[PDB]
Short mmCIF file of N, CA, C and O and ligand atoms in Angstrom, two decimals:
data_model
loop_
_atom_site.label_atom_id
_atom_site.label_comp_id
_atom_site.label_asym_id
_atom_site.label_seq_id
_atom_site.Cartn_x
_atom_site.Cartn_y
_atom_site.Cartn_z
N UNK A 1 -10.59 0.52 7.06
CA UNK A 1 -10.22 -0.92 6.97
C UNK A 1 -8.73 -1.11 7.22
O UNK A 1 -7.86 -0.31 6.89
N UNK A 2 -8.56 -2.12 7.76
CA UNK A 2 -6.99 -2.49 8.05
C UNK A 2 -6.17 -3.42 6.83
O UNK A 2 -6.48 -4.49 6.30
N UNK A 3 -5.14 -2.65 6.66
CA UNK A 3 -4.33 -3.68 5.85
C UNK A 3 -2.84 -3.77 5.67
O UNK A 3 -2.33 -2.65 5.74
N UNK A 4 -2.16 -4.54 5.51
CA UNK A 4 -0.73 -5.42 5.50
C UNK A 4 0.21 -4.81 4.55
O UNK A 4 -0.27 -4.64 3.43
N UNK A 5 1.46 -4.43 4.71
CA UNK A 5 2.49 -4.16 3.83
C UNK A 5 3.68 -4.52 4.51
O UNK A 5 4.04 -4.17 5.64
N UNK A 6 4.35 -5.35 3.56
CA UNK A 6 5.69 -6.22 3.61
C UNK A 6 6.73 -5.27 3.25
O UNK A 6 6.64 -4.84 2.10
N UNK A 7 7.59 -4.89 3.86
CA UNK A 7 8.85 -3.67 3.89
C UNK A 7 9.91 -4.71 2.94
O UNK A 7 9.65 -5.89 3.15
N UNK A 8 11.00 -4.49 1.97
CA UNK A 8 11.75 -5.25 1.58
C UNK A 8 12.79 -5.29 2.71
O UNK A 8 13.92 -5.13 2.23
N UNK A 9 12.81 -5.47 4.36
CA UNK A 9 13.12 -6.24 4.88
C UNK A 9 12.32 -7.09 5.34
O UNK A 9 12.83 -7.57 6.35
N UNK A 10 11.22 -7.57 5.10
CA UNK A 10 10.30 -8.43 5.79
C UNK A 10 9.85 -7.81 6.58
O UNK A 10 9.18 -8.57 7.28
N UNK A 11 9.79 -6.89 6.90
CA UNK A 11 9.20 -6.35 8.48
C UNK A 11 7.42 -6.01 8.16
O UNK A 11 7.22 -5.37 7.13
N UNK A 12 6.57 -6.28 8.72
CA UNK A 12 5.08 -6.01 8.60
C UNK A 12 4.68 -4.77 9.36
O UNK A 12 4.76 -4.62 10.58
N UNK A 13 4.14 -3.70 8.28
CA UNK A 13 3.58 -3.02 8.70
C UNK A 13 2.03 -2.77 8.82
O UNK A 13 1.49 -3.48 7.97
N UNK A 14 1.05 -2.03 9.56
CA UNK A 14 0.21 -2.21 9.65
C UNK A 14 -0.81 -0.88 9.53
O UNK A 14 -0.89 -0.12 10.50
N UNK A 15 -1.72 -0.59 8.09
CA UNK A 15 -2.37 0.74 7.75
C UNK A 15 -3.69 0.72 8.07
O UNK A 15 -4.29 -0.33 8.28
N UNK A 16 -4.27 1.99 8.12
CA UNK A 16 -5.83 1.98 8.53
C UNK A 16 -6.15 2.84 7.46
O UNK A 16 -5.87 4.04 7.41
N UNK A 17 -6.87 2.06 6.46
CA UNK A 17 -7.32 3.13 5.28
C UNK A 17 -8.53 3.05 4.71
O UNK A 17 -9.26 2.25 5.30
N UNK A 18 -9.03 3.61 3.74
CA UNK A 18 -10.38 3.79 3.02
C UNK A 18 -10.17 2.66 2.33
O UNK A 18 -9.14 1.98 2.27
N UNK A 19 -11.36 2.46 1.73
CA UNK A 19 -11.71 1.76 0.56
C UNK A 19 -11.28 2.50 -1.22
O UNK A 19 -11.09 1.95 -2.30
N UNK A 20 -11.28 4.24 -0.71
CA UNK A 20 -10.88 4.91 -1.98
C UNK A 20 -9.89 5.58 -1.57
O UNK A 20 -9.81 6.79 -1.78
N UNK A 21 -8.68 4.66 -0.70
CA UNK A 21 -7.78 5.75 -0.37
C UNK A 21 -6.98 5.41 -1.72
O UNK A 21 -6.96 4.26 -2.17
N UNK A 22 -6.28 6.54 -2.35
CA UNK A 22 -5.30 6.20 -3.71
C UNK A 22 -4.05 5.34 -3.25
O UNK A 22 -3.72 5.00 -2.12
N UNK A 23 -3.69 5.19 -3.98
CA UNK A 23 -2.50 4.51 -3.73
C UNK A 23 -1.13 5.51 -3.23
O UNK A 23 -0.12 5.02 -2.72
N UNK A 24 -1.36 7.29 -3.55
CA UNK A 24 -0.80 7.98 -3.03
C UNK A 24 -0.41 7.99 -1.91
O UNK A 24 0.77 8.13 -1.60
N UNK A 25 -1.56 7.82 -0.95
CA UNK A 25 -2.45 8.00 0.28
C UNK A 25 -1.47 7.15 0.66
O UNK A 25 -0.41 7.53 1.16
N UNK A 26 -1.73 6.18 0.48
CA UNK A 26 -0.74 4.63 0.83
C UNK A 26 0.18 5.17 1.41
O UNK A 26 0.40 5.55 2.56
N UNK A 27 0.88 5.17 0.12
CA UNK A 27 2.83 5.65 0.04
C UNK A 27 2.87 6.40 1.18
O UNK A 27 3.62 6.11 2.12
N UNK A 28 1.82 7.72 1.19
CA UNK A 28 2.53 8.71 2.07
C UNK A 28 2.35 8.12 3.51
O UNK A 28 3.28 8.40 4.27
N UNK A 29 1.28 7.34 4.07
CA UNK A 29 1.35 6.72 4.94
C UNK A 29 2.75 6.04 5.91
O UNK A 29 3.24 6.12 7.03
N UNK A 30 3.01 5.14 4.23
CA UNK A 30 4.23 4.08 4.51
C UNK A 30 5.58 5.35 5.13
O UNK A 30 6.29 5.28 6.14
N UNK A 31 5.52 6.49 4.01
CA UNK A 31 6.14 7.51 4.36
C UNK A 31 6.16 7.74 5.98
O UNK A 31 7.15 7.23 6.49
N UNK A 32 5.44 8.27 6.76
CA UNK A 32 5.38 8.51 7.90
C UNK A 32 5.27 7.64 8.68
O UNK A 32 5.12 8.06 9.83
N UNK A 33 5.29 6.23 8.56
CA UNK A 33 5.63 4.80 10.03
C UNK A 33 7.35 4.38 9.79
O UNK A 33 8.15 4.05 10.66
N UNK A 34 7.61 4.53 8.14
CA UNK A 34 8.98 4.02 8.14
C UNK A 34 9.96 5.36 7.76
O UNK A 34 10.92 5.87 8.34
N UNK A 35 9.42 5.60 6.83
CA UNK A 35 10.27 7.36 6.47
C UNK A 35 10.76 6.92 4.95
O UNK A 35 11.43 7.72 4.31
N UNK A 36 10.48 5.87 4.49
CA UNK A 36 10.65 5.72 2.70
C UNK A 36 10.11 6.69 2.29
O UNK A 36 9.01 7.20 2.53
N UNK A 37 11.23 7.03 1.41
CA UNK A 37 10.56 7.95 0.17
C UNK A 37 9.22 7.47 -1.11
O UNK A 37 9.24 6.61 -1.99
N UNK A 38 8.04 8.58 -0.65
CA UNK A 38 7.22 7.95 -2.09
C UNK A 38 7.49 7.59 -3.35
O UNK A 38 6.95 6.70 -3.99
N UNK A 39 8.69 8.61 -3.81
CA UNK A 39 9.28 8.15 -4.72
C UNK A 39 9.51 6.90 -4.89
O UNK A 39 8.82 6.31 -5.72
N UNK A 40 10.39 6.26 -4.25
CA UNK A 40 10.90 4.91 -4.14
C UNK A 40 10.25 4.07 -4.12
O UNK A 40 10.77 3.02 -4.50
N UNK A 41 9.13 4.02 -3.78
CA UNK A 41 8.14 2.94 -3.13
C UNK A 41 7.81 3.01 -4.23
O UNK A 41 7.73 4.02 -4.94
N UNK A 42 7.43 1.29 -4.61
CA UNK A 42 6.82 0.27 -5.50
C UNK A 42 5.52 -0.85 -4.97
O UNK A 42 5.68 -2.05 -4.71
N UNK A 43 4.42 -0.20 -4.92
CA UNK A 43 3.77 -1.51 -4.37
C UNK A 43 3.01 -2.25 -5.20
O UNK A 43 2.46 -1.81 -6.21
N UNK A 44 2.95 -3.48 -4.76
CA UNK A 44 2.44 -5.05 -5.42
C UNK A 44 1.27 -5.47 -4.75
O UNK A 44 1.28 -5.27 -3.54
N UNK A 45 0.39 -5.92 -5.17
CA UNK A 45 -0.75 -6.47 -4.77
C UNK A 45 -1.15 -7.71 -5.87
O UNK A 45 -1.56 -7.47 -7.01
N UNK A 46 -0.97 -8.99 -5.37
CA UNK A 46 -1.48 -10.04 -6.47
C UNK A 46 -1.09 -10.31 -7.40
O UNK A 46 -1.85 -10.92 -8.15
N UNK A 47 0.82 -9.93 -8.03
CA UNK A 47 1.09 -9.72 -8.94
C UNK A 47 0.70 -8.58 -9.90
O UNK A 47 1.00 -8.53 -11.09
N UNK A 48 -0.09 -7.59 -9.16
CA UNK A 48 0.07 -6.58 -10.04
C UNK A 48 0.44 -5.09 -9.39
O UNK A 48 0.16 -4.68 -8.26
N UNK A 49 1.28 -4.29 -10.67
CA UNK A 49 1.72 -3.13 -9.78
C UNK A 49 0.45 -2.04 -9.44
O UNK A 49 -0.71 -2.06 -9.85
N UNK A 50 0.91 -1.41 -8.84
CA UNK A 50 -0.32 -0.55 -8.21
C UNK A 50 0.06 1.12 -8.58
O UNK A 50 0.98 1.79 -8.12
N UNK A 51 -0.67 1.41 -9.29
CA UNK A 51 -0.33 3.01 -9.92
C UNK A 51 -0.56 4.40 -8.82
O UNK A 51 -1.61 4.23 -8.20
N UNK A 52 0.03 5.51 -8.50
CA UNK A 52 -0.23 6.19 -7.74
C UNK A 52 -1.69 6.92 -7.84
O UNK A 52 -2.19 7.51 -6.88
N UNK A 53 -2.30 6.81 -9.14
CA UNK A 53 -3.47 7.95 -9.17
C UNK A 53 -4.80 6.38 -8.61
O UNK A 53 -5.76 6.79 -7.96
N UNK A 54 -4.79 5.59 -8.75
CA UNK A 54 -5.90 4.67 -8.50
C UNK A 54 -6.25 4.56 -6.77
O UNK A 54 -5.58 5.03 -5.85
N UNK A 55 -7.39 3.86 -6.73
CA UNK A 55 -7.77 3.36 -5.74
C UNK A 55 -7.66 1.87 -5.44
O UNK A 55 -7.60 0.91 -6.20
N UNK A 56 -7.66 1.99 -3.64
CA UNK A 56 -7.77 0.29 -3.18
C UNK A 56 -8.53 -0.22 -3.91
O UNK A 56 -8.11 -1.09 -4.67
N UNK A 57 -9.75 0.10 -3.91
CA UNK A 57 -10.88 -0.66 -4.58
C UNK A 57 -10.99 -0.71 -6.02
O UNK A 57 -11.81 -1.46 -6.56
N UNK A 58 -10.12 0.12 -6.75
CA UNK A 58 -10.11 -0.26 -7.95
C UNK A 58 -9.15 -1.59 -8.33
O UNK A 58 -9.39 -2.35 -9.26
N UNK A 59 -8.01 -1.71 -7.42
CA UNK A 59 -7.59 -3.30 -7.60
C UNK A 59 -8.17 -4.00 -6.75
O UNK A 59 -7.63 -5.09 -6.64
N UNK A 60 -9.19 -3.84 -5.97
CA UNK A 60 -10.37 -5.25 -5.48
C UNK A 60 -9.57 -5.71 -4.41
O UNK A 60 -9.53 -6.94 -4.28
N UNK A 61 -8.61 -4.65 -3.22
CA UNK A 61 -8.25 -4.63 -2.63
C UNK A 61 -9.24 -4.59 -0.88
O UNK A 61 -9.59 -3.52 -0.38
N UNK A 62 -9.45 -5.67 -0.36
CA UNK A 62 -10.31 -5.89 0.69
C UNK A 62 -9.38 -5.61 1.92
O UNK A 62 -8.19 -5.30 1.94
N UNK A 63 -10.49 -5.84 3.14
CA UNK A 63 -9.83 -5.79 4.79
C UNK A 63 -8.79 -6.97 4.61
O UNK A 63 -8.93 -7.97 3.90
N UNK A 64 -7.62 -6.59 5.47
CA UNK A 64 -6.86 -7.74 5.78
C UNK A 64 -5.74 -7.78 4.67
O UNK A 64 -4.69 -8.30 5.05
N UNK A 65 -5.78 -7.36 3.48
CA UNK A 65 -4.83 -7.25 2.62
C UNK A 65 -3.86 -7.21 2.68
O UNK A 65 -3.55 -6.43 3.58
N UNK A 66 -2.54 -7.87 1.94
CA UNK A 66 -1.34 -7.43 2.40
C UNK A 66 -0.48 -7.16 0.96
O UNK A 66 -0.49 -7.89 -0.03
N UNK A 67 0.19 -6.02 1.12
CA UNK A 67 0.81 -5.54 -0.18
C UNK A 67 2.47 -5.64 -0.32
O UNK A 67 3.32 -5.50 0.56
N UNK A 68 2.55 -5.76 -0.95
CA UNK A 68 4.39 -5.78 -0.72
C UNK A 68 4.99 -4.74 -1.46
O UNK A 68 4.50 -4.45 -2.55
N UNK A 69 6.40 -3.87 -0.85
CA UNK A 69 7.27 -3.10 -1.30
C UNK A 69 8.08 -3.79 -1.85
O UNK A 69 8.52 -4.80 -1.30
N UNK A 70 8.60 -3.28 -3.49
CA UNK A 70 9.53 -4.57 -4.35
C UNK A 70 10.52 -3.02 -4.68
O UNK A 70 11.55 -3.08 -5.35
ZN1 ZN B 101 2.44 -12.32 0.41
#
């Protein structure tokens, strides 16, 4: 599934992931299109933070989604 993440410059990036990809998965992604450190990275979905051991689908995270780096 495809989905949206807002860089804290505004810039849109664009992921192709599972439904149970962790939120690890994510990061390391974001890791390799921009080169942020996982460490660093904070992501938001809906007002809520997003923990590294969970899944998309455990925050009810659908196609088209867009997450933001804070
Ligand atoms: Zn938004």
């Amino acid at each position: 599934m495809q989905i949206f993440v807002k860089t804290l410059t505004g810039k849109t990036i664009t992921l192709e992931v599972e439904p149970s990809d962790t939120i690890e998965n994510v990061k390391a992604k974001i890791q390799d299109k921009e080169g942020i450190p996982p460490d660093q990275q904070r992501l938001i979905f809906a007002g809520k933070q997003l923990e590294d051991g969970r899944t998309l689908s455990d925050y009810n995270i659908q196609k088209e989604s867009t997450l933001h780096l804070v």
